[PDB]
Amino acid sequence: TRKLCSLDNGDCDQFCHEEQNSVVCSCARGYTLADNGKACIPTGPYPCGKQTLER
C-alpha cells in the first residue's frame, strides 16, 4: 500500500497531487521536475518564490 500527500507532502518540493495510489508531484512555472519525480529544479536565473539575496 502507498498513498497520501499527507505523509510529508509526498516528498514533493512543491505541488503534490495523489493519483490512484502514487503521490505524483508538480512544479510551479519556471521549475522543472527532477528525474526523481520529486524535486523541482529552477529553470531560469531568477525562479519565482526564491529570495534574490546573497544565497
Next chain:
Amino acid sequence: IVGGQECKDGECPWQALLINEENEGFCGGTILSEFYILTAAHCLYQAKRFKVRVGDRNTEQEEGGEAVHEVEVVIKHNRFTKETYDFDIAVLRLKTPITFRMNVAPACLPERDWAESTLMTQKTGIVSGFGRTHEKGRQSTRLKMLEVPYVDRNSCKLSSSFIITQNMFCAGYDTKQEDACQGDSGGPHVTRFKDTYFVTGIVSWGEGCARKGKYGIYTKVTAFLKWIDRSMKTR
C-alpha cells in the same frame, strides 16, 4: 506595517509599489511575472493615473536598483464593490517587462488544491509594504515585513463587525500589536513552503491597525487563481 521587522537585501523581492503622479506610494503589489502585478481592486481609486516602482527598498534614498514601469492595461475585478469589499482583486499589465535582479523577482502562484491545504494549513504567512507604522502616524520609508498567523474563519467572522465573505480570510494577532495597515493595501501575503514562496492573499482591509480583538483581513487568492490566469492571457 505596524510593529514589524525590516526587509533585508533580497528578502522581499516580489514587493511592488503603486506610486501616483506625485510619486506617492499609495498602495502595494505582488510581482507575478515580467508584465503582471497583482493588487487590490480598491487601490485603483486613490489615483487618476499611477506607475509601478520595483526594486525600491527605501522610499527616500535612491540607491539604484529601483525601476518605474508604466501600466499598459488595468484588469480590475468586475464584481468589486466598495459596499461589500468582496472580489477585492485586480491584475495590472505593464508596458515594459520587469528586469529581474537583486530585490526584484516574482512570487510563485500555487494551485487551488494544495494552497487550500498545505499552504493555508501552515500556521503563519508573510506580509509586507511601505504603509503606516502605527495608525495615525507616518507611512514607512523602509519596506517592512511581518509574520502573521492564520486565523480560522469562525473566529475571524466573530471578530469582524462586517461580513467576511468566502473570498476573504483573516490573518493577524488578537492582542499582540502587529498588523498591516493603511498604505499596505494591495500588498502581498506570501506563504513559505520549504524554501519557495507562494502568493496566498493580498492586503485588503481591516478595522484599525493592530486593533486589539481585530484581525487584518486579506483577499483569498486561492479563489481567484483561474481569474488570474484569464487576466494574464488577457481577458
